[PDB]
Amino acid sequence: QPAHLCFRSFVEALKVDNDLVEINTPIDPNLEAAAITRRVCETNDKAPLFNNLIGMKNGLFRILGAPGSLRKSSADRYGRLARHLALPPTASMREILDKMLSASDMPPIPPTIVPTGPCKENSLDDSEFDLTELPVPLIHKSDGGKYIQTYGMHIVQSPDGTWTNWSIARAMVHDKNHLTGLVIPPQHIWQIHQMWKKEGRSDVPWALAFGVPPAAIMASSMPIPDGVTEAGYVGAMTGSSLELVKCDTNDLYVPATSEIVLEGTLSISETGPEGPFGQMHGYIFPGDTHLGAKYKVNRITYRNNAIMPMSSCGRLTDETHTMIGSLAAAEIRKLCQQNDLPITDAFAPFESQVTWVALRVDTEKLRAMKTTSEGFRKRVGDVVFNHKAGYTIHRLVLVGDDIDVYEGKDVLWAFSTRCRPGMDETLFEDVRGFPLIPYMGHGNGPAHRGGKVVSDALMPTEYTTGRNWEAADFNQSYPEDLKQKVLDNWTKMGFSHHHH
Amino acid sequence: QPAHLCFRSFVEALKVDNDLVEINTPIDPNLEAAAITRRVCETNDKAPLFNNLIGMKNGLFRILGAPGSLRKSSADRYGRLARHLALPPTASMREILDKMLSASDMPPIPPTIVPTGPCKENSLDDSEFDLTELPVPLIHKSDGGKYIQTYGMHIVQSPDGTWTNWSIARAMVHDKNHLTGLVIPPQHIWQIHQMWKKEGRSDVPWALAFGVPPAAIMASSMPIPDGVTEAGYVGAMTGSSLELVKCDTNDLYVPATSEIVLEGTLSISETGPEGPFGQMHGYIFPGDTHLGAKYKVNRITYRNNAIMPMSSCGRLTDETHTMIGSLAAAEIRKLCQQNDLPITDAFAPFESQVTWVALRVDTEKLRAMKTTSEGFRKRVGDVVFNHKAGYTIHRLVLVGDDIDVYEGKDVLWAFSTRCRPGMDETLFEDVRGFPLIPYMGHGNGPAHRGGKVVSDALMPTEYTTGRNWEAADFNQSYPEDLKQKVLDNWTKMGFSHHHH
Ligand SMILES: Cc1cc2c3c(c1C)C(C)(C)C[C@@H](O)N3c1c(nc(O)[nH]c1=O)N2C[C@H](O)[C@H](O)[C@H](O)COP(=O)(O)O
Ligand SMILES: Cc1cc2c3c(c1C)C(C)(C)C[C@@H](O)N3c1c(nc(O)[nH]c1=O)N2C[C@H](O)[C@H](O)[C@H](O)COP(=O)(O)O
Ligand SMILES: [K+]
Ligand SMILES: [K+]
Ligand SMILES: [K+]
Ligand SMILES: [K+]
Ligand SMILES: [Mn+2]
Ligand SMILES: [Mn+2]
């Protein structure tokens, strides 16, 4: 099976790419696996495959860390991401985001039901598993539980059967047969939970699939629109219908090659302690436990020699930056274009801990609008911050055509030099805030409202007659024939490879 | 003579450090020298010494580019700066800034007058030079003139003789015997010019010395207090009295080993076209010529085989970032401590294009003040933004004890995650602004007022009971014995030098 359609094939692809280290000696799931993974993420090293987990029993489980993290070289920086999508490993960020947006103007390709697949190779009923006995990792030293769920896909369906959502949301082991996790607005798992709660008749049929098709975990991490079934979007994106098999104890459908599948229910009434968790902005507040949603597990099915993917998230750079930030940015690009705003490109700079999105403006288009910074800031911020795709993002930075939004150094340059503090910004206090950001949920103001800003790093003439500066840099402040002469004589004179 | 006391010795020190490239083939001062220098600055390469300048006549002149720029390795990153001050080349930023502040609580060491020195080896009178015939560089393609003055020291004295100031301010050739340049408030050259203008009797006696003692050019770049003679400050800092020789045509005194000396007058009445210039924020606005101050040159004296230092300034990283930003930060640290604020460290992040200063707070001290973010922001901003040492700085970022302000990644992390936009900031509109920043002088609001902000990246409990988080990073989220185990097994497992 292809790497983008089968997680086991994806692991082999990373091996073959010399982007994997197989660790075959015993590693403790209590902190050690995650500490190695954290080190990998902080240094852009090879992904670790832990083949010998202390406490693995009857095939459950190996761990792959850092599945969507960065590579060290510039040339294949995003190569792990590319391998989720059948793209060349030297793909740029723009190419990866365009692949994830491509299905937005295509008919869905609904999934294909097959009678079995590798995820049915083994099963454990209600009397045969205990989630507290599996080698679930403790990811950070102060975490409030063992976070089994950092890179699986929650599967829930609307009561009327018309929408089946696939998403990533964290969950931890509560007891032998229950998890607790985050289910918060405006996320689709929460929106669907609310529909079940309003109907009031039963708990939500649920499945959690780990080691799913890499293209499916990417869509799981992307804010595609309300009511759109991720399976059909991924089918469109990849050009192929995804093969799904029915759960044994409910009527949901899971990827046939899922490594591990939990089947059960998401309660419409019960809660349980959840968190704290070391999270995407780089923090853990020890002892900050709150009540989260509660899931009951009725059945586990799994592949022979099952592998659980794990994100050891926190400070730069891991899946919470490369996937959450970038895929929100992509959806924000599209949303702005659909609202007739002249946005060409969007990216969440890693240096902002993916709390900012830089929006590259087609300033020829802007000039024809004959508008002003105040008006334009307001319009952009009303579109993005009143939509779900803006949820996680607290600062939008508008930049002109000379800035590459995929390069955080240039975004930082433009923000620092072109946006006058106060005057060139509009604050938004009556929008949904992201409470996970420390300055929200642990800050001075309301955890769930406000704290957002549009910062205009367009210069005045970009609205009127055109750019009226040149950069004071080697590229822009010297003529071409001089530049080339300097480059050609560089090593001759005494001064000091693209792949490496 | 020691490197920190003699520019010629400094050049030799860079050679010996393998931090120089001597270019002995012909290089054009029209753009080529500066383009090589710009490339060096953008890549942290070795400093270029142009020994064969097209148009050099009778010893005037060789050029040394990038005299205070960065080195490529992390271990001796600031080594060129260290060599201005007799510090080891592996000196940290904190050590360099502490050396520049050290004379602030020492008695001055006034200079020593000697009868001659190397700067008198050659001279040209009123009938023998023409500034338009010297190999003055064109630094950027759209510059409004040939900027002879990017790394010399202007020397002016108060009318009453009590204060002699040394400072860097840009100047360009106007004609055969005049320069034009920036002389703007609140800078000391402007403050002294105003005193002469108020007296109204004559033009200001002036000298411009190039290739001065490296320790003197550093103090020239630092906002030491009003009325304090830089020579005596440098004498205190270095522990030695600086040797000065009298000018031939006025009664000012220049460093005895200056490479090149211009003697004349700064007009109290005349102006002339000046700029545009590719400047420290990375921009040039072509055609933006304004009237600047006018200097008359009566005499040139110079060393045999004179070398003119040159800053090819613009985008990161050059002397305008490493010296202007850092030395302002140092003075701001001191100013805050003198006003009883609990600041331990200050640095202008390069990523902000040196428009921000991050202030590290001793949060034990802060807690004992029993204050609030609003009050504390206000107090810090009133102290810094109403002083000259805050002139260039438009954003102050307050951070707690866990942030290393010398590491821009950590400053960016804390600003992005701990400061709520709007709520955690105070805008200052009734302070002096820095008009050179594009969003000031070419922006939407008054070029000379406002546009400043204090951004509080202290968390709420840092004012009350103490830090209540741990970072979700390898250092803070794993116990010590685990960390060391991981590091010790790193290469054994399969994963991947301080000097490199
Ligand atoms: C890639 C990725 C995404 C997320 C998460 C993680 C990773 C690795 C964790 C490591 C598990 C950390 C956790 O904070 N986490 C997470 C989460 N969204 C939540 O509601 N709850 C969460 O606990 N997202 C983001 C969501 O996946 C996206 O916002 C997506 O858009 C949701 O899908 P949908 O509602 O649009 O269908
Ligand atoms: C290191 C350095 C400092 C400065 C400059 C440059 C370099 C390399 C130029 C490349 C020439 C660019 C120019 O923008 N420039 C410059 C300038 N200050 C100005 O009033 N005018 C200027 O044109 N400073 C800053 C000043 O040197 C300091 O602010 C110092 O504090 C002044 O001394 P004082 O008034 O405190 O005595
Ligand atoms: K999704
Ligand atoms: K602006
Ligand atoms: K000075
Ligand atoms: K704050
Ligand atoms: Mn969805
Ligand atoms: Mn001074």
Author numbering:
A (entry chain A), B (entry chain A): 4 to 499, 502 to 505
Study authors write:
Residues Arg173 and Glu277 also occupy the same position as wildtype in the high-resolution crystal structures for E282Q (1.13 Å/1.28 Å). One structure shows the presence of a minor species corresponding to a prFMN hydroxylated at C1′, whereas another structure, obtained from a separate protein preparation, shows unmodified prFMN. Residue Gln282 is observed in a conformation within hydrogen-bonding distance (2.9 Å) of His284 (position II). Additional density in the active site, in the position usually occupied by the carboxyl group of Glu282, has been interpreted as a molecule of thiocyanate (a component of the crystallization solution), mimicking the CO2 product. The E282Q variant of Fdc1 is inactive, which could be due to the inability to catalyze (de)carboxylation but could also result from defects in cofactor maturation. We reveal that crystal structures of E282Q do contain additional density on the C1′ of prFMN corresponding to partial formation of a hydroxyl adduct. This strongly suggests that prFMNiminium is formed. Furthermore, the reduced prFMN is not stable in the presence of oxygen, rapidly forming a purple-colored radical species. Both the E282Q variant in solution and crystals of E282Q remain colorless under aerobic conditions, suggestive of prFMNiminium formation. Hence, Glu282 is not required for maturation of prFMN.
